[PDB]
Design an enzyme around this catalytic site. Structure first.
Site, PDB file in Angstrom:
ATOM      1  N   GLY B 251     -20.728 -21.906 -13.165  1.00  0.00           N
ATOM      2  CA  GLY B 251     -21.588 -22.860 -12.490  1.00  0.00           C
ATOM      3  C   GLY B 251     -21.420 -24.296 -12.882  1.00  0.00           C
ATOM      4  N   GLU B 299     -18.072 -18.033 -17.916  1.00  0.00           N
ATOM      5  CA  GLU B 299     -17.206 -17.645 -16.795  1.00  0.00           C
ATOM      6  C   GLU B 299     -16.993 -18.823 -15.843  1.00  0.00           C
ATOM      7  OE1 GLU B 299     -19.607 -14.385 -15.231  1.00  0.00           O
ATOM      8  OE2 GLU B 299     -18.557 -12.913 -16.456  1.00  0.00           O
ATOM      9  N   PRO B 300     -16.508 -19.964 -16.330  1.00  0.00           N
ATOM     10  CA  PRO B 300     -16.315 -21.093 -15.410  1.00  0.00           C
ATOM     11  C   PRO B 300     -15.201 -20.780 -14.424  1.00  0.00           C
ATOM     12  CG  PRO B 300     -15.183 -21.537 -17.480  1.00  0.00           C
ATOM     13  CD  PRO B 300     -15.993 -20.253 -17.686  1.00  0.00           C
ATOM     14  N   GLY B 301     -15.424 -21.142 -13.155  1.00  0.00           N
ATOM     15  CA  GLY B 301     -14.382 -21.054 -12.136  1.00  0.00           C
ATOM     16  C   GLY B 301     -13.966 -22.425 -11.630  1.00  0.00           C
ATOM     17  N   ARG B 302     -14.839 -22.997 -10.800  1.00  0.00           N
ATOM     18  CA  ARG B 302     -14.595 -24.285 -10.147  1.00  0.00           C
ATOM     19  C   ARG B 302     -14.116 -25.362 -11.112  1.00  0.00           C
ATOM     20  NH1 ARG B 302     -16.132 -26.137  -5.209  1.00  0.00           N
ATOM     21  NH2 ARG B 302     -17.544 -24.382  -4.806  1.00  0.00           N
ATOM     22  N   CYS B 379      -7.320 -24.701  18.279  1.00  0.00           N
ATOM     23  CA  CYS B 379      -7.737 -24.815  19.672  1.00  0.00           C
ATOM     24  C   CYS B 379      -9.182 -24.348  19.709  1.00  0.00           C
ATOM     25  CB  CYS B 379      -6.833 -23.982  20.559  1.00  0.00           C
ATOM     26  SG  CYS B 379      -5.118 -24.633  20.575  1.00  0.00           S
ATOM     27  N   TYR B 414     -11.469 -22.596  -4.630  1.00  0.00           N
ATOM     28  CA  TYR B 414     -11.905 -21.853  -3.447  1.00  0.00           C
ATOM     29  C   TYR B 414     -11.193 -22.296  -2.155  1.00  0.00           C
ATOM     30  CZ  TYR B 414     -15.495 -20.282  -6.735  1.00  0.00           C
ATOM     31  OH  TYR B 414     -16.155 -19.704  -7.840  1.00  0.00           O
TER      32      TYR B 414
END
Ligand SMILES: *[C@@H](N[C@H](CCCN)C(=O)O)c1c(COP(=O)(O)O)cnc(C)c1O
Ligand SMILES: *[C@@H](N[C@H](CCCN)C(=O)O)c1c(COP(=O)(O)O)cnc(C)c1O
Ligand SMILES: [Cl-]
Ligand SMILES: [Cl-]
Ligand code: NA
Ligand code: NA
Ligand code: NA
Lengths: 459, 461
Positions: B251, B299-302, B379, B414
């Protein structure tokens, strides 16, 4: 109140299995064209989509019969709706043409057997390589979306010494310039057509428009068609020509909620509002004020395949969560059911607030009598299905167990190419029920070896 | 109003090339780690993403330095953020661990070099086959998200005669029942832990939570961590055990707009609002009210990859559209620029209203002085970028031409696995800048042949 919503939803459930041209029940299970879907979901790993060639044929018949009052009508399936090769093949074998939205869509359509004279290529970004490929393949139409792209069409057609067949896309102002990226302004049509006539290897066939998707009223088609017809009539007089055609685009809606007596299509366009017949009546009425011999081209997408697939997903986990008061006494319980498909599999349920009927296909004859919340498997707090029967709540049998198969109906439009491999969950397999009622796999599930084969690494 | 918005945006532009540890300019072109991105986009077909291994290493250092007051901290990159193999390899080389969110994510982490003892497996749907694969590979943690799943963990660990190491995920109620599908209720933690202690092949290591994504204040982490800590302390006493760890999830936000003097993170979470240091101070302070020796897992992701990629996309068409009144007089002109990337390439710009800085990388030193609307190639009437500098309008140099390269910054979290083949436009290639400043392709663009090969059909004759 909620009891009436539950009664209404169970009336709809009974109508699915006792009146709907697509569905039956057998052994307590939902069937699609005679195929038991619980049984099918034991043969193939869930989640997966199953398409019905019979239903595609029925949808195409509705479209073509709608245009019976105008004989010279040509129908192009908008392949961006679904381009799995076996789906394109069913559509080709049903006797209609194809519309494409990229160089690779054109190539797919040619490779599945549509001739060049059965293909329309649309787009706002048609690079020189895209245009060269289309012109070299003698496409029936390449639309003209901008003056910039027209300069490339002129140059490339001259280089190939091959005629490029075009329609000029105009977007009528029925805010257009600020909200619509596509087409030319009506004010630009005359001079653009004049210059096309003078180009040696560009042939002008007519004008083009496309109103939108899932349009719940006929007036937008009538008004936009009239703008295109009035300008076609005027340009024939000014330029001294007779157009081959008018191309009025797509947008015939599909019912995603069926209880029309309870719905307002202009507030909730999951109610379809109009039929293919209404779309045709509006279009033909305007075209016939000018010409009865001219070809009308239509580009339906959603209506061809939308009703013709079901997403089958296994209930794979469950939990109860409870809100407690200050004394530790229960306030309410929430029953969560987890299925093995989330928004990476059924993207429009999340990203476009799209409603699809949800039923327990393993218990389709049982009352759907318990309020549940329906979650997907992605490690993301937002991956649950918010478009419920009542707010964010769905109805399933209280007897629902892990291992039951849940079905999402009307899952045939814009559901395959929009999938992702988020969390490294694979994109789904796809099964086809053919005209004889037999099933076959037409797209495999992504394998692990698919997850990493695009990457370049040493391990 | 609009003039000052334009002035402010060009102040931001000069900061990119003057005082940003990632960027420079050369010959009027934006450069990333000294790689000219206009030139790079002439080598590789657009659109594509370019990642910077130096910037990933910088981000990991920021996270690790932030936890200096707690030596027993273990860091697991949330691989759902980006699992391209070359990116995972760089993260492993930087010395941290991995969190995985499916069986195939576990498998790719093992195949890129993370040991089982460096992998956490999280999820709300862990089917028997997923659990068997995880237990067989001796993962550091498998979270427990439900009582139903726990029954399978007991049965499968018994079958394999192999200990499953678990943490019990609790969702702190800080409506949780109606809106949080993940975790157990706090009220269920005691009995769940009791059951686990009695299972012969399940080893309870601690509790787990995850607050959310792009969280722009420290208070939610502090409040939620205190709930988890209080229950950890209580269960040690009730059950007579000493937990190995507490896992507080991810987070940490990343700045997507940088001019914090003009932004409110509580109204616009594109402004980061807190740093990795603020996250660590909040977490560590709550844990140390219980134990200073217990292991903290994060648990860092971003934060690991977000600032570490750019999306490069070529201006591929242009047009002017004009609105007229009913008597033929002009009301407004709209200048549209079309790029070759749309929401199928950059999904969050559409589906999650995500802002990314947009500049003309080919004209990075030129004033961005014209209001334009920026469209993709799909389109589809809705495929244009709505998260503009002002409403739906962006700013580019007046002399922007077809052929220029547009860069979207902060495009590393992401953005890869979320791509689609809508309209049969291919998912993009991915380039990596290594520690020496050299480039290589680490993911190919989908070919025509790749795209048709999943389908089963007879080739027409
Ligand atoms: C497709 N038009 C798109 C559909 C977006 C779905 N998420 C739009 O935005 O309008 C299209 C069609 C088919 O439209 P249908 O609504 O499926 O019938 C036909 N012609 C063109 C040019 C087109 O872009
Ligand atoms: C990721 N949680 C998702 C992120 C989805 C964004 N589109 C969420 O909704 O919270 C996650 C993480 C990493 O989160 P970060 O925000 O990238 O640091 C860590 N642990 C878990 C369990 C998790 O789901
Ligand atoms: Cl036809
Ligand atoms: Cl025992
Ligand atoms: Na299954
Ligand atoms: Na001509
Ligand atoms: Na135990």
């Amino acid at each position: 109140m909620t009891d009436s919503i539950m009664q209404n939803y169970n009336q709809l459930r009974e109508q699915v299995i006792n009146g709907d041209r697509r569905f039956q029940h057998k052994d307590g299970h939902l069937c699609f064209e005679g195929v038991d879907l619980d049984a099918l979901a034991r043969q193939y790993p869930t989640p997966f989509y199953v398409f019905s060639e019979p239903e595609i044929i029925r949808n195409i018949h509705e479209i073509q019969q709608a245009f019976a009052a105008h004989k010279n009508t040509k129908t192009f399936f908008a392949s961006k709706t679904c381009s799995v090769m076996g789906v394109l093949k069913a559509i080709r074998d049903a006797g209609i043409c194809a519309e494409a939205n990229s160089q690779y869509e054109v190539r797919k359509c040619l490779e599945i057997g549509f001739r060049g004279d059965q293909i329309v290529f649309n787009g706002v970004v048609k690079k020189p390589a895209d245009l060269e490929y289309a012109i070299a393949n003698d496409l029936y139409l390449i639309n003209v979306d901008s003056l910039y792209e027209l300069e490339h069409i002129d140059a490339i057609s001259r280089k190939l010494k091959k005629v490029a067949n075009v329609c000029v896309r105009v977007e009528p102002n029925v805010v257009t310039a600020f909200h619509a990226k596509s087409g030319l302004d009506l004010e630009q049509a005359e001079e653009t057509c004049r210059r096309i006539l003078a180009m040696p290897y560009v042939h002008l066939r007519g004008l083009h428009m496309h109103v939108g998707d899932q349009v719940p009223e006929s007036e937008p088609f009538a008004k936009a068609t009239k703008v295109l017809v009035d300008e076609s009539r005027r340009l024939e007089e000014v330029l001294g020509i007779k157009f081959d055609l008018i191309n009025v685009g797509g947008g015939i809606p599909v019912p995603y909620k069926y209880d029309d007596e309870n719905g307002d299509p202009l507030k909730d366009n999951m109610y379809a509002g109009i039929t293919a017949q209404d779309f045709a009546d509006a279009v033909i009425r305007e075209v016939h004020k000018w010409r009865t011999d001219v070809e009308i081209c239509i580009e339906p997408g959603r209506k061809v395949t939308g009703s013709a697939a079901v997403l089958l997903t296994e209930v794979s986990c469950e939990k109860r969560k409870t809100n407690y008061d200050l004394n530790g006494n229960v306030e309410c319980h929430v029953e969560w059911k987890f299925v093995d498909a989330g928004y990476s599999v059924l993207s429009d349920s999340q990203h476009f607030d799209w409603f699809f009927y949800v039923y327990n296909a393993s218990r389709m004859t049982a009352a759907h009598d318990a309020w549940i919340k329906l979650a997907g498997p992605l490690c993301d707090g937002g991956d649950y299905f918010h478009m419920g029967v009542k707010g964010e709540e769905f109805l399933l049998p209280k007897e629902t167990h892990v291992g039951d198969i849940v079905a999402f109906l009307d899952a045939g439009a814009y559901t395959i190419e929009s999938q992702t491999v988020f969390n490294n969950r694979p994109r789904t397999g796809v099964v086809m029920i053919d005209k004889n009622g037999d099933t076959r796999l037409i797209r495999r599930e992504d394998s692990y070896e698919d997850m990493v084969k695009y990457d370049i690494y040493l391990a």
